A and B are shown apart, each in its own frame.
With several copies, the nearest count.
Chain A
Amino acid sequence: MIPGEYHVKPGQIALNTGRATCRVVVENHGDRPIQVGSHYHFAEVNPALKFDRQQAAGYRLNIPAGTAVRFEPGQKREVELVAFAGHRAVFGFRGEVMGPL
């Protein structure tokens, strides 16, 4: 008896089902660590991250909502991305889209 205890049913959940995904290799070319959040528009991440921006366009990281991927200075890695949904209008970030796509 633990007050307020959960009895979670075993297994797993599949995240962002039914949306396009793509993998891209990213290298942190800066001298300071950079960490990226689950819903940030990946194409507009800090310019010290070198990768193919045009592929990442309209995508975000395919990871649990609210988690992050960290890139130490020099670090190279392959990430998986999932496309944005809703109206697919991108506002903010680096101010590179600011409208639909």
Chain B
Amino acid sequence: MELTPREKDKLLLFTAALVAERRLARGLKLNYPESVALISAFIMEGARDGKSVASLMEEGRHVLTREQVMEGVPEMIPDIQVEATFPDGSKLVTVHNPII
């Protein structure tokens, strides 16, 4: 596979998001690192599907609501940023105020 350090690093992010998706499914309110992981992982998969940067800056605001996360968590996350390989190469997606 010839994995580069950056590909190995994103594997760490995907795994932390698997921890969060399971907890969300048991119906827990997510904490800080769990929330940041879950939303980041969703944007990396949207770039793999070929969605545009602009579509993802928007859809990323709809993954989790304030009722699915612990108190103070939406305030601890003013934005989330993640880069992924889009069909047109690496691009940065910034989601502002993702948890409303």
Given contacts A1-B71, A2-B75, A3-B75, 5 further A-B contacts (CB under 8 A): A1-B72, A2-B72, A3-B72, A3-B76, A5-B75
How far apart are the CA atoms of A2 and B75 in the complex, in Å?
7
How far apart are the CA atoms of A1 and B71 in the complex, in Å?
7
Residues from chain B with a CB closer than 8 A to the CB of A3 are 72, 75-76
**Smallest CB gap from B73: residue in A:** A3
Residues from chain B with a CB closer than 8 A to the CB of A5 are 75
**Smallest CB gap from B72: residue in A:** A3
Chain A positions 29-64 with a Cβ under 8 Å from a chain B Cβ: none
Chain A positions 62-84 with a Cβ under 8 Å from a chain B Cβ: none
How far apart are the CA atoms of A2 and B76 in the complex, in Å?
8
Within the complex, what minimum Cβ distance (angstroms) separates B35 from chain A?
14
